[PDB]
Ligand binder design. Structure first.
Ligand SMILES: *Cc1cc2c(cc1C)nc1c(=O)[nH]c(=O)nc-1n2C[C@H](O)[C@H](O)[C@H](O)COP(=O)(O)OP(=O)(O)OC[C@H]1O[C@@H](n2cnc3c(N)ncnc32)[C@H](O)[C@@H]1O
Ligand SMILES: C/C=C/CC/C=C/CC/C=C/CCCCCCC(=O)OC[C@H](COP(=O)(O)OCCN)OC(=O)CCCCCCC/C=C/C/C=C/CCC
Ligand code: HEM
Ligand SMILES: CC(C)NC(=O)c1ccccc1I
Ligand code: SF4
Ligand code: F3S
Ligand code: FES
Lengths: 613, 239, 138, 102
């Protein structure tokens, strides 16, 4: 107050994030006729979806004949039955419809002989409910899929009159009596604070990949909206589930796509054996994104590493046709030469299992509404929506199937715009906020700007990142996870000892990294505490001590003479985590998985079963 | 130990009448990444956290780390440092742009030019969109190769002398390439009226083929080629 | 906000501020095609000023062209100085003529790659020297 | 759509190829008829050349007028000066011949 120029803006809807989901929501609201604002710390193009390489999943069936219901089955099979089947229904239903939308927007999709969109093999896909074979349903723009996606989404976004607050760091949500009223954001350009108030708020800030030392994600993937929800007292779903992508360059930790394995890429250990025969003989090296990476990490265990350090594994493209690599995978051909210093068509690529996607996030239904947990039941948080990687409608569940998140972006981003347009009309009076609101966020900014401590922003970041990379790895034991807990918890108390250098208003990257650090910590405590409490092997989260699947029934034997286990005895439930901001204490309760689909007659519910792909 | 010297452009707007000046930084390359951005991150995270620069993907596809390295506009995460310690690496912001702070240029004009060319697919029958995928042949898809990859890093236009002298009225190679990108696209019908917008001496014709645009591209694209290809379409299009 | 409304607020902010411009030619590394394009303007400005000083002198100065050469002949002819003055006339001419073809080749679209610029760039530079020496003595 | 700046680019290039085909033609066939065509094409190309130098560097409204009006004055006085030189004197073709033979 009085120290910072407070400028209040009046809008119908606010969308925080300018990724794939953020954009689709933003102009999708202005399409319905809403006065929409969009808050983003980066420039729209310079988000992350740009880094997307594999492709967008759609059951169009341009290669072979395809049904969208088979795409539903593999998503829920890949989710290890923690995936909410009602949200998976809606996403796989809109799958072909929403991609044809993007092609008509201007996306330069690769083509075949018939002139239709090029679909290609990807990990986890199958025809005829996992009986037919390998399905080709990954629509791609030749290794630069998300790049051209975001540009065409941004291209279309200039058709409508949307107020884009470009390079504005949102700190917290404007919240009053459980009702959402907008966001309080800092302008990066001059340092002035803006209290942007609106009737509806859509959160699409993306994931928190930078919680670990080695990640494929960007420097600006810090899970800010996930921590924004955290501070507001609202829960966060399935945060312990962290996607370890099998194929990531040994050097900087960059991503070479799973589409490499789809075209004909092979994974080879030091001795020469194609190790993806000892583990997954059914679906070769094109198995689930968790099973492949977990097989790689177990190959290092024996001492069969492929380098001078004996730590990484090789991905070979030595046998692939010369022009097939240049046409289908031109982006990886250049990034492997730039970073790893490796010719793709002559040598194998040094790859290692690294952090990729964040399965969890803000609790959400299929409509896009943010859910809270009241009396063991689900309650809609008014005026608050979430979509994309930042959200967790659990359309991915325990394990995300490859190339599904771009669908998750466009489908659920579109859903949020429709859920608002059908909720109210553009012109419904904006709920006024008290003049003292955002006080705890402005004071946090002022306290963090002048912060004189013992350890600096970078020292605490490396302390968190290396600890998460050592403790909450691919394999995790109740011994190391418990040790990692009070190791992370202590670092939250270290936030009082923060050393800042810059005291300027205009572009303080030293301050906003620290703002990112506070946000990264909240998405680090819930990741480690949720993992230590969960005692089973499901999807990405595989326990050494608890190597079994703990469901309501033992689904190996027929379901008849079996007593149903009570809710607090099986781990087939969503891990909802809260945290008191002052002490850093993490308390956690649970939400039941959604099994019933949107329509049983149109799409049948898939019962849990053993999954070794 | 292998200590490398870095000369970096610095201007702090919160310093009351501060003039822009260079600053030297001492960095050991043994415990440092191969790229310039890794070195910029290192001094940010160790030596001086007052250095303010744009970063994101460290992959060379977002275009945030755009700057002038040793007299050439490239991406910092793509360009690797010269191991020759006898030379000092000079790091400047994108040439002839209003500096906000230390290597951060104001690109509000650059983006607005990209907004003026309308980088979206336009049809005459927009009533039938969003239900049936538009057909495009493999060769018609090849017409977009080496054009759609543009990251909009702005290394392009900022290397052009015409964009220095007339950045206000001249669009620049980055923007002009995208305008061309939406001309040869077989799905776009508004080809003639896209060429109609450039019918003034400044929008397009301020290019004199200096060729500093192509010579500097981080993605290995050829923007100038497209500009001279527009000029051909401009003189030949009927009505 | 519209397309050209962002441009207005860009100029109404930056021009009325203490924001300094990043250095341009002060720091940018000299490349051959760049420096060759500067010379093509330089030879253009020099030649146009040459022709302008030729036509204006025909209207302002008394006497015919023959008598204007009789004062050049009066000042005892330079041994190799006559070759030097003749050299510094075809040298700016032939450079501009040869590079003028190269600029015209670029208008058709052919030869716009980076390797071809340094290739045809040297060719123009060499054909300048070969038609400056081998033209002044004709 | 009315293309005016497009013709100015094309019309300049047609003058360029005409001037390129005049220099060897003036050497091989030096006459009075070659003198007027060369003078016209030489002063046209030069005018459109400086016209580009003006539009690239001359910033302003009042300055843009004066630089274009001032250039037009020089261009018209150069073409008239050469046409006077072609008519009531040796001409351009003979002038170079007498300058070289010295
Ligand atoms: C990491 C990654 C992910 C990825 C991929 C490759 C990499 C390296 N390739 C994919 C692929 O080929 N196919 C696919 O289906 N998915 C792929 N992924 C996963 C997925 O695409 C990404 O997770 C995706 O980019 C997420 O998109 P989303 O729109 O949800 O989030 P974002 O793209 O990261 O955009 C973030 C935006 O939010 C704004 N932001 C963030 N914090 C703030 C604050 N503090 N204040 C204001 N704005 C904020 C940023 O501005 C940014 O624009
Ligand atoms: C503006 C005007 C200013 C002019 C001054 C600039 C002079 C440079 C021009 C160089 C051209 C080479 C001329 C070589 C020569 O000696 O001509 C041949 C001569 C021997 O006869 P021959 O050829 O042996 O006779 C045989 C007949 N077939 O006689 C000729 O045939 C005359 C041919 C010259 C034509 C070139 C005129 C172009 C002027 C360029 C102006 C550049 C401004 C700087
Ligand atoms: C027959 C030989 C010549 C050829 C082939 C030629 C060709 C060209 C071309 C194509 C250009 C445009 C460059 C571009 O921007 O792409 C140019 C520029 C120019 N020329 Fe010539 N020219 C010739 C002789 C002359 C002469 C004798 C003069 C003197 C009156 C002259 C004066 C100029 C000027 C002032 C420019 C402007 C520079 C620019 O805009 O880049 N040229 N020349
Ligand atoms: C390189 C800079 C200083 N010189 C120019 O400005 C320039 C040179 C030749 C052609 C067009 C131009 I706009
Ligand atoms: S065309 Fe190349 S140099 Fe120009 S903005 Fe795009 S990536 Fe940068
Ligand atoms: S640097 Fe230049 S003037 Fe044209 S050829 Fe490239 S835009
Ligand atoms: S940071 Fe993405 S291009 Fe350098």
């Amino acid at each position: 107050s009085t120290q910072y120029p407070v400028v209040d803006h009046e809008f119908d809807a606010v969308v925080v994030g300018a990724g794939g989901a953020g954009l689709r929501a933003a102009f999708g609201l202005s399409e319905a006729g809403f006065n929409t604002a969009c808050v983003t710390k980066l420039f729209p193009t310079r988000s992350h979806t740009v880094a997307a390489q594999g492709g967008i999943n759609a059951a169009l069936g341009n290669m072979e004949e395809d049904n969208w219901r088979w795409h539903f089955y593999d998503t829920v099979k890949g989710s290890d039955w923690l995936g909410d089947q009602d949200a998976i229904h809606y996403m796989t239903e809109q799958a072909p419809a929403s991609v044809v939308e993007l092609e008509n927007y201007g996306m330069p999709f690769s083509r075949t002989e018939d002139g239709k969109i090029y679909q290609r093999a990807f990990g986890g896909q199958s025809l005829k409910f996992g009986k037919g074979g390998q399905a080709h349903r990954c629509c791609c723009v030749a290794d630069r899929t998300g790049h051209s996606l975001l540009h065409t989404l941004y291209g279309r976004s200039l058709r409508y009159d949307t107020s884009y607050f470009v390079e504005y760091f949102a700190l917290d949500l404007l919240m009053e009596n459980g009702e959402c009223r907008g966001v309080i954001a800092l302008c990066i350009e001059d340092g002035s604070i803006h209290r942007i108030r609106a009737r509806n708020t859509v959160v699409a800030t993306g994931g928190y990949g930078r919680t670990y030392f080695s990640c494929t994600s960007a420097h600006t993937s810090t899970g800010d909206g996930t921590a924004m929800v955290t501070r507001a007292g609202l829960p966060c779903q399935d945060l312990e589930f962290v996607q370890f992508h099998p194929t990531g360059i040994y050097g900087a930790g960059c991503l070479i796509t799973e589409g490499c394995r789809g075209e004909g890429g092979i994974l080879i250990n030091s001795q020469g054996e194609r190790f993806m025969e000892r583990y997954a003989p059914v679906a070769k090296d094109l198995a689930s994104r968790d099973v492949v990476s977990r097989s790689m990490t177990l190959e290092i265990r024996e001492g069969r590493g492929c380098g001078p350090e004996k730590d990484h594994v090789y991905l070979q493209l030595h046998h692939l046709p010369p022009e097939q690599l240049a046409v289908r995978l031109p982006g990886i051909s250049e990034t492997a030469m730039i970073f790893a210093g490796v010719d793709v068509t002559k040598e194998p690529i040094p790859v290692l299992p690294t952090v990729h996607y964040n399965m969890g996030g803000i609790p959400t239904n299929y409509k896009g509404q943010v859910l809270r947990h009241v009396n063991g039941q689900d309650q809609v948080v008014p005026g608050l929506y979430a979509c994309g990687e930042a959200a967790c409608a659990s359309v991915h569940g325990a394990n995300r199937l490859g190339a599904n998140s771009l669908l998750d972006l466009v489908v659920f981003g579109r859903a949020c715009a429709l859920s608002i347009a059908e909720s109210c009309r553009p012109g419904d009076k904006v709920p006024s906020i008290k003049p003292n609101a955002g006080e705890e966020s402005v004071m946090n900014l002022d306290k963090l700007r002048f912060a004189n401590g013992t350890i600096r922003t970078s020292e605490l970041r490396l302390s968190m990142q290396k600890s998460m990379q050592s403790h909450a790895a691919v394999f995790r034991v109740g011994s190391v996870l418990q040790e990692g807990c009070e190791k992370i918890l202590r670092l939250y108390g270290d936030l009082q000892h923060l050393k800042t250098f810059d005291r300027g208003m205009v572009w303080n990257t030293d301050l906003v990294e620290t703002l990112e650090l506070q946000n990264l910590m909240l998405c680090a405590l819930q990741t480690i505490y949720g993992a230590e409490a969960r005692k089973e092997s499901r999807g990405a989260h595989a326990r050494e001590d608890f190597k079994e699947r703990v469901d309501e029934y033992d689904y190996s034997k027929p379901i008849q003479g079996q007593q149903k286990k009570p809710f607090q005895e099986h781990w087939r439930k969503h891990t909802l985590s809260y945290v008191d901001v002052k002490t850093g204490k993490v308390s956690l309760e649970y939400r039941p998985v959604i099994d019933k689909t949107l329509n049983e007659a149109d799409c049948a519910t898939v019962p849990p079963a053993i999954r070794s792909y | 130990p292998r200590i490398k010297k870095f000369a970096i452009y610095r201007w702090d707007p919160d310093k009351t009448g501060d003039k822009p000046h260079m600053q030297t930084y001492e960095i050991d390359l043994n415990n440092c990444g191969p790229m310039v951005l890794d070195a910029l991150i290192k001094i940010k995270n160790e030596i001086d956290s007052t250095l303010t620069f744009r970063r994101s993907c460290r992959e060379g596809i977002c275009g945030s780390c755009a700057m002038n390295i040793n007299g050439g506009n490239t991406l910092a995460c793509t360009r690797r440092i010269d191991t020759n310690l006898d030379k000092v690496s000079k790091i400047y912001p994108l040439p002839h742009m209003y500096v906000i702070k230390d290597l951060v240029p104001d690109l509000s004009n650059f983006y607005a030019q990209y907004k003026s060319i309308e980088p979206y697919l336009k049809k005459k029958d927009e009533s039938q969109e969003g239900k049936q995928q538009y057909l495009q042949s493999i060769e018609e898809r090849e017409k977009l190769d080496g054009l759609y990859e543009c990251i909009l890093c702005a290394c392009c236009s900022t290397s052009c002398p015409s964009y220095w002298w007339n950045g206000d009225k001249y669009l620049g190679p980055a923007v002009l390439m995208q305008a061309y990108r939406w001309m040869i696209d077989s799905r776009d019908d508004f080809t003639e009226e896209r060429l109609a917008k450039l019918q003034d001496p400044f929008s397009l014709y301020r290019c004199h083929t200096i060729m500093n645009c192509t010579g500097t591209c981080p993605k290995g694209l050829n923007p100038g080629k497209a500009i001279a290809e527009i000029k051909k379409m401009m003189a030949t299009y009927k009505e | 906000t519209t397309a050209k409304e962002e441009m207005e607020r860009f100029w109404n902010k930056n021009l009325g501020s203490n924001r300094p411009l990043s250095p341009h030619i002060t720091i940018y590394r000299w490349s051959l095609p760049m420096a060759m394009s500067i010379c093509h303007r330089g030879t253009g400005i020099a030649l146009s000023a040459g022709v302008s000083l030729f036509g204006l002198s025909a209207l302002l100065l008394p006497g015919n062209f023959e008598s204007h050469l009789e004062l050049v002949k009066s000042l005892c002819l330079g041994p190799t100085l006559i070759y030097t003055a003749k050299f510094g006339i075809v040298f700016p001419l032939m450079y501009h003529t040869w590079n003028g073809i190269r600029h015209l080749i670029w208008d058709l679209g052919k030869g716009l790659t980076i390797p071809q610029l340094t290739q045809s760039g040297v060719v123009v530079l060499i054909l300048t020297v070969l038609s400056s020496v081998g033209l002044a003595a004709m | 759509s009315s293309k005016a700046a497009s013709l100015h680019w094309t019309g300049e290039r047609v003058v360029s190829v005409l001037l390129l085909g005049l220099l060897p033609a003036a050497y091989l066939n030096p006459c009075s008829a070659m003198d007027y065509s060369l003078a016209a094409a030489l002063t046209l190309h030069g005018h459109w050349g400086i016209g580009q130098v003006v539009t690239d560097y001359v910033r302003g409204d009042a300055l843009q007028k004066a630089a274009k009006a001032g250039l037009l004055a020089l261009s018209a006085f150069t073409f008239a000066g050469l046409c006077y030189f072609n008519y009531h004197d040796v001409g351009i073709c003979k002038a170079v011949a007498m300058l070289w033979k010295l």
